[PDB]
Structure 1
Amino acid sequence: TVVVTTILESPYVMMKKNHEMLEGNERYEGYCVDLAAEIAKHCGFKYKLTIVGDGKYGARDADTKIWNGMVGELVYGKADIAIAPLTITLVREEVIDFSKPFMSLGISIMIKKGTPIESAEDLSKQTEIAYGTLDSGSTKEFFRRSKIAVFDKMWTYMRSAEPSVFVRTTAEGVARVRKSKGKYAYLLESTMNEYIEQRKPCDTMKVGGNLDSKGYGIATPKGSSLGNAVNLAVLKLNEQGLLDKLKNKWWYDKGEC
């Protein structure tokens, strides 16, 4: 039985309301739960969904050299595959294998409806409306390293803004936008942004085009005997229109706004 590590991130993997009455894989629902069943069908395996212990995606502590999260579970042999919204990055790709992306995304801007901001350029031209990113990760790194005039200006502002515009978690960034009365905008991944936009109380909005591009992929330990088939399954599912069907299902069909 293949041990699948995943993460409780909506709408990818969520506990069903009546989860206490259920056991195993049936306790969960979501985009990745559906995707897991599809991957298993196309690769011919049985699996057990397990939520990553530390609730993380996966980063390497710079001093201790240790990997946490789902990446850590793969690197250390605790799971056979990770079917979750895990970003395909260079550092991760160096220690684990990734399938081709099953979903594309990029940095975007989330505002509280009513806020007079329509782009990154709008944000950069003022300070009245504070804006920031998660305190660590791809979005923060993008701005810190950017050579582009507009993004570099946003970085100079964010890195010295007081009080701090950085947040510890994505939920905090979304909550800060919602409870800041039009005075805060949050830079986060487009997928999460468009998802929140379809959730009650329907008070947020995604503005402007994506600032960069990246993709989520299914991961397996380096040299895994599942890698090849998993990759082919992703490509097949995309061409069959299934990946798009699942995106529409969990974001819009199940939307509230």
Structure 2
Amino acid sequence: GANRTLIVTTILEEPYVMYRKSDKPLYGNDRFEGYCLDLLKELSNILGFLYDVKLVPDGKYGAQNDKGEWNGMVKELIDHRADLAVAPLTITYVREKVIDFSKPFMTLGISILYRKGTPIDSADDLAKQTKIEYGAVRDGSTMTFFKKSKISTYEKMWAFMSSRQQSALVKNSDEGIQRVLTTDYALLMESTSIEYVTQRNCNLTQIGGLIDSKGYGVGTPIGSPYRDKITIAILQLQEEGKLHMMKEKWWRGNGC
């Protein structure tokens, strides 16, 4: 019979996955557009499968609590409720214990998003002061980085983030961006998203450099037969320069 339609889990995240602007409500895959949809289109052709896009119910990428329980996109793969995770899913050692990743299709690092025209120049200045609140998206890889850090400054920053019942954390990037714009708040964010936001919000800027270096990969359940095929597909898109064209399509624009 025809090849089974694969279930792709993802999360609304600009410019990776976005609702296509329309008056008439849209249904199925046509609801979405973005870098990851274009990536899913190319992978779909190379491997030869249809796909059905489903958003993660809790809107989280995935972290494990003190009870060892995962949530978010990672948990969807563990429980075999999705065949692939085509999203900016950060490749992390802790995540590699419970799911598989393709080779990375994009590189990034943690950095700080904040308003322009301030004397804040680093995470040290941010952790050393009191006026400015700061945090990260809840139950993402950036939160996990600070939660697990063994570095003194980042340990203090996590203690600050987890205080007052984690009020410094935000539900998602969009909520975090709005918090930066409307309050005295700095968002610990991955550099690829900062590049997108700062070009379209010329009053914001990146503070300091990268405090780590990671990559995004396609997530699959352990033992998935598609992992190696997906990796081969990513490599083909690199030699063809397609991944570069996709980046420019959804990021490149007029600078501030």
Change in CA separation of 1:77 and 1:145 when aligned onto 2, cut-off 3 Å = closer
SS class of match (2:225):
coil
Using the size of structure 2 for normalisation, the TM-score is 0.84
Q: How does 1:212-227 map to 2 (within 5 A)?
A: 212-227=212-227
Deviates more, 1:44-53 or 1:1-10: 44-53
What is the identity, as a one-letter code, of the residue corresponding to 1:26? Answer: D
Superposed CA offset, 1:192-218 (max 9, x none) = 222211224x32111221100111110
Deviations 1:68-103 (A, max 9, x none): 322222222222111011111223222221101111
TM-score by length of 1: 0.84
Name the counterpart of 1:101. 104
2:39 is matched with which residue: 10, 35, 45? 35
RMSD: 2.8
Q: Is 1:166 the counterpart of 2:168 in the alignment? A: yes
Query: Could you tell me how far apart the structure 2 residues matched to 1:190 and 1:230 are?
Result: 25
Distance 1:154 1:97, change over 3 A: closer
Give the deviation of 1:188 after TM superposition: 1.5
| Cα 1:141–1:57 shift into 2, 3 Å | closer
Partner of 2:185: 184
Alpha-carbon distance in structure 1 between the residues aligned to 2:228 and 2:23: 33
Q: Number of matched residues?
A: 251
CA offset digits 1:11-63 (Å, max 9, x no partner):
11111011745432222110000000011112122222222233221233443
Counterparts of 2:15 and 2:220, CA distance in 1: 22
Residues 131 and 165 of structure 1 are in contact (CA less than 8 Å); yes or no, is this contact kept in structure 2?
no
Structure 1 residues 142-192: Cα deviation after superposition (integer angstroms, max 9, x where no partner):
345445455456556x35878977223233332222112xx4322221122
Residues 18 and 115 from structure 1, CA distance in 2 versus in 1: closer, same or farther, beyond 3 angstroms?
same
Which residue is equivalent to 2:208? 208
Equivalent in the alignment of 2:199: 198
Name the CA distance, whole Å, in 1 between partners of 2:106 and 2:135.
Answer: 24
SS in 2 for 1:187: strand
1:210-249 aligned at under 5 Å gives the runs 210-249=210-249
1:77 and 2:90 are equivalent in the alignment: no
2-structure distance, mates of 1:132, 1:92: 21
Cα gap change, 1:144 to 1:188, in 2 (>3 Å):
same
**Distance (Å, rounded) in 1 between the aligned partners of 2:44 and 2:167:** 42
Identical aligned pairs, as a percentage? 52
